[PDB]
Amino acid sequence: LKEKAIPKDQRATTPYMTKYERARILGTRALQISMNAPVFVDLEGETDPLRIAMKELAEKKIPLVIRRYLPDGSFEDWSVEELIVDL
Amino acid sequence: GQQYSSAPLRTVKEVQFGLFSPEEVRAISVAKIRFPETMDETQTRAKIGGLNDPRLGSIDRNLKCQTCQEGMNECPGHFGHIDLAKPVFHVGFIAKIKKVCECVCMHCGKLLLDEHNELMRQALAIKDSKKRFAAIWTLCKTKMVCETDVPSEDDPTQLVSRGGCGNTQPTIRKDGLKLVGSWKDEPELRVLSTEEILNIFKHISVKDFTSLGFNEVFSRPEWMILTCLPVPPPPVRPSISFNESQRGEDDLTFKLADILKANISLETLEHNGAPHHAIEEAESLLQFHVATYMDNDIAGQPQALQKSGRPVKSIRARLKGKEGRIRGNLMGKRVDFSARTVISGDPNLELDQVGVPKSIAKTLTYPEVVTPYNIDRLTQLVRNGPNEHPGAKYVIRDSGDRIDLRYSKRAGDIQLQYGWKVERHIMDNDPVLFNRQPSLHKMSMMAHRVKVIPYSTFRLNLSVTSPYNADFDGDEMNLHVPQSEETRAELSQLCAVPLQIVSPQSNKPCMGIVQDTLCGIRKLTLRDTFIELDQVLNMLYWVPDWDGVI
Amino acid sequence: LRFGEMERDCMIAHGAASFLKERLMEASDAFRVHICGICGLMTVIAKLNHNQFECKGCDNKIDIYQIHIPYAAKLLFQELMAMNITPRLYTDRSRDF
Amino acid sequence: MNVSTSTFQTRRRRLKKVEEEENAATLQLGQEFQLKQINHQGEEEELIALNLSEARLVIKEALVERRRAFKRSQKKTREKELESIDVLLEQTTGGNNKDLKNTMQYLTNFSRFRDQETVGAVIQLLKSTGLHPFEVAQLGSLACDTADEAKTLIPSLNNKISDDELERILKELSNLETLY
Amino acid sequence: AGRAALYKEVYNVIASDGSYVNYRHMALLVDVMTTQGGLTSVTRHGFNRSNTGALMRCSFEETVEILFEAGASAELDDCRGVSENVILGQMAPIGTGAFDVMIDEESLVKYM
Amino acid sequence: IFVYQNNITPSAMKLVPSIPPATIETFNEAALVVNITHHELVPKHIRLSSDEKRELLKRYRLKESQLPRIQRADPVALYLGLKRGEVVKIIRKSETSGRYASYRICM
Amino acid sequence: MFFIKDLSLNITLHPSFFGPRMKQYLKTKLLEEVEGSCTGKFGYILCVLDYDNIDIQRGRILPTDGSAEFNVKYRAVVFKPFKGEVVDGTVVSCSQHGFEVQVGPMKVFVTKHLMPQDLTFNAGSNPPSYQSSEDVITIKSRIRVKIEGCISQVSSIHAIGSIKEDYLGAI
Amino acid sequence: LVKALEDIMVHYDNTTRNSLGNVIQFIYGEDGMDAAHIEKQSLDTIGGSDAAFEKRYRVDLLNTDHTLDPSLLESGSEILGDLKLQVLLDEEYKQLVKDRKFLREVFVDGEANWPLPVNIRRIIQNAQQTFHIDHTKPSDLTIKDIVLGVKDLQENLLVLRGKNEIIQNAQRDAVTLFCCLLRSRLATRRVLQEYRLTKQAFDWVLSNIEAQFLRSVVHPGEMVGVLAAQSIGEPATQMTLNTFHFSKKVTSGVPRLKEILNVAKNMKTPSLTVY
C-alpha cells in the first residue's frame, strides 16, 4: 500500500520539531558533514561538524525530511526547512 | 563480521518462530555426525569425519572451513545432524504432547470433540491460538470415547455419524519422560511408545491441528517429537584448545557424544539380537540424554552430572536469565570504550564537567575522520603519539587496516588523507556518559564535558552528587565514550547535565546547592554579615561572568 | 565495563536510540551474518570473495541478505536451533499494523 | 547473491519449498514473465514482448535520448546503420557492456522491418490477432511462408488461429518486409 | 472505580514516605494494570502473559519456556518492542528512533 | 429484565438465550439496593452507537483490539446493558486536564 | 520474446555525493550496475529506457553510517531465452562436437547429434564446417535454432539448440 | 515496573501506546504535557467567600460603585452605562462562576495549589518589570481588548491538531483545567486593577503564555513508559518503613507496594472507611 503516505494538506502532527528530531537532525548532518559531505551554509570559520550542522539548521539549509510514523504505519513527511524550532 | 559482502544489507522486521521438521534438519546439515570421537585417528591430532569435523566449522586457526573456507571470525558455523535410532520427546514439549494426546483419539487421529458439540463450537471460535488450545483441552481431556455417531443439530433422537472409530481413550499420566495410559474387570496399563504417539500425531488433520494451537507450515505437532537431531557447530560449543598435546571440549560436546554413544548402542542393539526388554532400556537412555542436553534441571528427576559430579550445562540453563544470553549477553553487555575509577568531588569544576584522570584520557579514544577542518590538528595528535596527552593511538586507512602508532615504523612520517580515521585520545569538552550504578533514574546516566586532569579519581561537581546518589565514601563510577558524530549529538542534545536539571519525576529540579555551599550560603546571607572591600573585590573576581562593575 | 540492563533502561528513558545501539553493537559484539530469504536462517554458505552464497536445501543462491546483529544474538539463535526451535529472521514485513 | 534488481511483482514465498515449474512454449514463461504484469504506477499492465525490428528501434531511441540528456548536462541504412549504432554506443554506453554491442549488431542484422512507420503497421496488423504477446513477437521476428512453417516454429499457436487466417497475416508481413 | 482506588492506594504508598511523584507516572502504571478490563498484575503471570513480542517477554522471568511455546505455536514477533531491537542490535523505535530521516534531492539542489 | 430475590434455578436459567434476537437480563434484588453508578469513584459511562464507535476507531486509526476493554460482567457494563463489542465513552474528572475521556470496548 | 520490464535497483550513496549532481550520480551508478547485467530471473538487462525520467524517490538515511539508500525504479529492455523458443542466429564457433550460434547477447550450442544425420563434420576446411548433400554450415552461416534448454551462468545464459526438426537449419 | 512499561511511548498522534499499538492513555497523563514543564500554581476562583470572589472579579459598568474607576483605564468615563459592553463582562463573569463551580467538582477539598504548565504569575511579574508598569496612570486597554484577547488566546493553546469533532473535543478537554487558571488570572478587573497592564504589556503576556504553553506539551518519541516505571521505582528504593513503631495501623511503604503490584488477594490490613 501507499495509502501509507498522509498528504501535505490534511496532516496533523506538531508543526514544531521534537527534541529527538532535532538531536537526530543535528547528529545526522554532523555525521554527513564529518564524512566530507557538501555543506550548504557558509562556515564562517567553523570546524566542529556539530557546530556546522547547527549553523545549517539555524539557516534552515538542511536538505533532510522527517518521516513521522503513526501507530498504524502511516506517515507524514515534514521538512527540516518547514518545522518550527522553538526548543 | 569484517570482510566485504555483495549481499544486500537489511534489518530483521520479523521473527517467525517454528519447529524443525526432520526433513529440514537433514537439508540444512553439512555433516552426518557419526562418531563420538573428536579427532586423533590415523594418529593426526586434527578433527575427525564424525563429531566437530571440518564440514561444521574450524577448531584451529586454519583459514579452512571446508564449507565456506572463511575462517573463525567470519564463519558463523554450520549445523550437522544425528539420525536417532528411535524417536524421542523434546523435553520442553512433553506436557504439550500429553495435552495433544488428551485432545485426540489415540487410534484414528481425529480430534475427540467435533463442531457438533455446542461448548466445543464456542471453544473453536476463540481467536487466540493459545486460549483456544486451553479451552479445547479442558473440553476433550474428559472425553474417553472416540464417537462413531453423535446426536444431530436438527434432532437429538436420530443420531448422525461424525466419522472416526469407536475406541476407548486412555487416562494419561506423566512418569518421568514417559507417558502411561489406563483404558477400561480392572483397567489395562501400558506405556505409550514415542513411535505410537508420533504416528497418531502424523494422522492429525491440518484443520484439526490448526484448530489446536499448531501451524501447517511452521509447527506441525509431529515436530515436537525428535527423529533427526541438529548438531550445533563448534562456535556454540567451543573447544578451548590450550597447548598442542591438550584440548578442552565444551559440556555440550560431551553431552552430544553421550547422545551419539547411546544412539549407536540402541541402533546396534535393535538391528542385531534384540532382547526387546534391553532395547526399551537403551531407548530410555537416548531419551534421557536428548532430554537432559536441552534441560538438565528437570522436575523430580536426577541431574545428569559430569565426571566431576558437576551438573552439566543444559542449553536451557545457558539462556535462563540475570546471566543468560538474554538478560546478561543481550539486554546487558560488557562494553569497549568504557572506564571506571573512584570518584571525588571538586568545587572548581562546572556542573556539566567531569574530571578525567590523564591515564584514562590516554586509554579511551574517539574515531575522528580526517577532513579539511581537522586534517591539520589530527596530524599533530598523530605526531604527539599514544604516550603524550593530546595525542592519538591508531590511524585507520581507506583500506580499513589499522596503524599502531606505538610500533609502526612509519609512526613519525604518517601523512593523513581525507577519509582516514584517527583514533585520537579523548580531549577536554568531549561529551561522555557518566554513570553511577544502580541505574534507577534517567539521571543515573548523564552526559558530561570532559576535563582532563591529574590524579587517579573522576572529579565531579558537588551539586550533581544528588541525581547520581554518589558519596565520596569510596564510591566508583563508569564513563562511556561515544564513537559517532551522531551518538555524541545524542548525549549533548538529549542527556547533558544542564538539560537533566528540572526532572519530570516531581516536576521540580533534581539538583540544588548542598553541603559546604548550603551551610555557607545561610551564613553569608545574614543581616549581621558584612564584607570589607579587600574581600568584596576577590568575591567579585571569582564570579567568571561578573560585568566588571563594583 | 558493564552496560547492563539498568543502563539500557536509562538510555531508553532518554530516548537515545542511536547511543543505545552503539553501546550494544559497535562498542561490543556487533557481527555480520547471512540470512536465507526463503527459510530465514543463518544457513547461507557465503564464500564471499568468490561471490558465492547458497542455502543448500532451499537451492537458493538468489534470495540472500546480510544482517548486523550482536554475536550473542547470532549464538542465541543457533542455541534455539540446537533445541529444535526455528527463529526465522525476515527482512520484510508480512502483517502490517 | 549481490544487490540485484527487484521487480514490480510481490513474492509471498514464505518457507514453502522451491515449487518452481518448467519454462516452455506451452507459453509457460516465468512468473517474472506472466501475461498480467504490474507497472511502477501500481497498475496492471499486459506483458511487453518485442520483435527484433521493434526491439532495435527501442534501444536506438533510448540511447539517442540519453545522448541528448548527456549533451544537456554537459552544457552547464544496413551496414551504414551498423557503423552508426557503434558510434551511439561509444557515447551513451559503458563500453564494458559487450552484451549491448553484440545485441545491436544482431538486431541491426536480423531486423525484418527497418523504419518506424512499417514496424507500427506490423504491430497494428498482429494487434488484431489477439494472440499471446510472445506469439505476436515471434510472428514479427521469424519469417514464415507456410501456415505450417509458422505453426511448427510457434507451436504455442496451433488451434488459436485458422490456417488460412495466419497465411493472410504471413503474406501481409512479407509485403511490409523492408528491402534492407 | 477500581482504577481510581488503585491510583489512590499507589499514591498513598508514595505520599506516606513524604516523597512526591507527578500524577502521570502513577496514573500510567495504574492505567496499564487496567486497560485490559480487569486487574493485570505487574508479575510473571500478569503483564508478561500478554500478546506482546515473544522475544520481548522472554527478556523477563520465563525465558526458555516462553521461547519453547513460541516455536510450538509458530509465534510471529512484530519487532516493535524496545527489547527485540536491543536483542537484534537495531536502532529501536524509541525517542530518536520514532521517525525516519530522508534526503530530499529537490531541496538539496535548491540549496546549491 | 428479571429482578430475582434469592435464586433462579438452572432449569429456569436454560430459557435465557432461548428466545433471540430478544435479550434477557437476570438481576439480584440485593445487588440493586445501592445504585453503584452513584459512587464517588464511578465516572460517567456513555454507550456509543454503531456510527459513534466506527468514527472513534476511524479518528484514532484503531482496531477494536487496540481499545482499552471492559468485561461484559463489569457492574457498570451490566447497568447499561452492554452487549459484546459495544463501546462505552468514559468521562472522568482529571487533576491534570479538567475533564478526560477514555473509551472501553465490551467483551 | 525480448521484453520490456519494470525493475528497481537499491543504491546506497556515500555522504560525499550529497551535492547537487546527486540524481545525476545515482542515474549513472544505476547504469553502471544494472546495464549489461545478466540474471536468471530477468535474463540480460540490456538497455535502460527513458534515462531522462528515472525515478530516484526519497533516499532513507541509514542510521549508524551517514549513507542514504534509494530505490531507483526503472524500465529496461531484457532478453530471456526459453526452451521451445525458435531463434535466428549466426555461427560463432564450430568443432567435431557441434557449432555455437550467436543469438543477440547469448550463444546457443547445436550438438553433432542434434543435427540431421546427412550433415557431417569436416576438419579439413578453413574455417571448419558441417557438410550436407545440399547446404554447408561454417563460421559465418545464418542458422534457425530451436532452444532445447537453458543453463544460467554468472553474467550469461547459455543454451543448447537443435536444427533436427522441420523448418530449422541453414537460412 | 520497568519490564512492564518498557514499550510505552507517546506517538505522533499525542496517544500513549505499547508495542501492540494498544491505547493506554488517550493523551499522556490526561493533559498531554511534559512533566518537566509543569509547576504548582494556585487556581484563585476555587477558594474564599463568594463575596470576596465577587469583589475580585465582578465588573458592572451599570453600577456607579461597581464599575472600573477611570483611574484604572482611559475608557472609564465613557464605559459607564455601556449596555453592549456589560453583556461582555456579564458573560465573562458568568464563565468565571461556571469555572468556580466546576473546579469545586474536580478538587472537592477546595485545594487550589495544583501543578499546571504555564507560570502565569511570573509572566505578569516579568511584564511589569519589562514595561516599567506605573501602578498610578490609567491603562490603555479596552474591555474588548482584555475580554476577547483572552478568548482568542485560548483557541491557540493547541495540544491536539485534527480537523474532526473527536480530536477537537479531545483538544477542548485537554486544555479545560489550564483555561480555568487562565480565565482566573486574566479577568478584566484583575488585569486592570491588580496588575496594571498596558495594551503592549497585555499583548506580550498573551504571546508568552501561548509560546510557553506550546513548549510545555510532550514530545512524540517520549519513552514515557520507562519514565513512569523509574519515577515510581527509584522513590521506592528510598523508603525507611514499615509504618512507624506505635487511628488504624495500615501496612505501608515497600510491603504495601509489593502487595499492590502483585494484586495480592490476601492482604495484610484489609479495611473499609464508612462515611
Ligand SMILES: [Mg+2]
Ligand atoms: Mg558508599
Ligand SMILES: [Zn+2]
Ligand atoms: Zn563455514
Ligand SMILES: [Zn+2]
Ligand atoms: Zn478414533
Ligand SMILES: [Zn+2]
Ligand atoms: Zn533457506
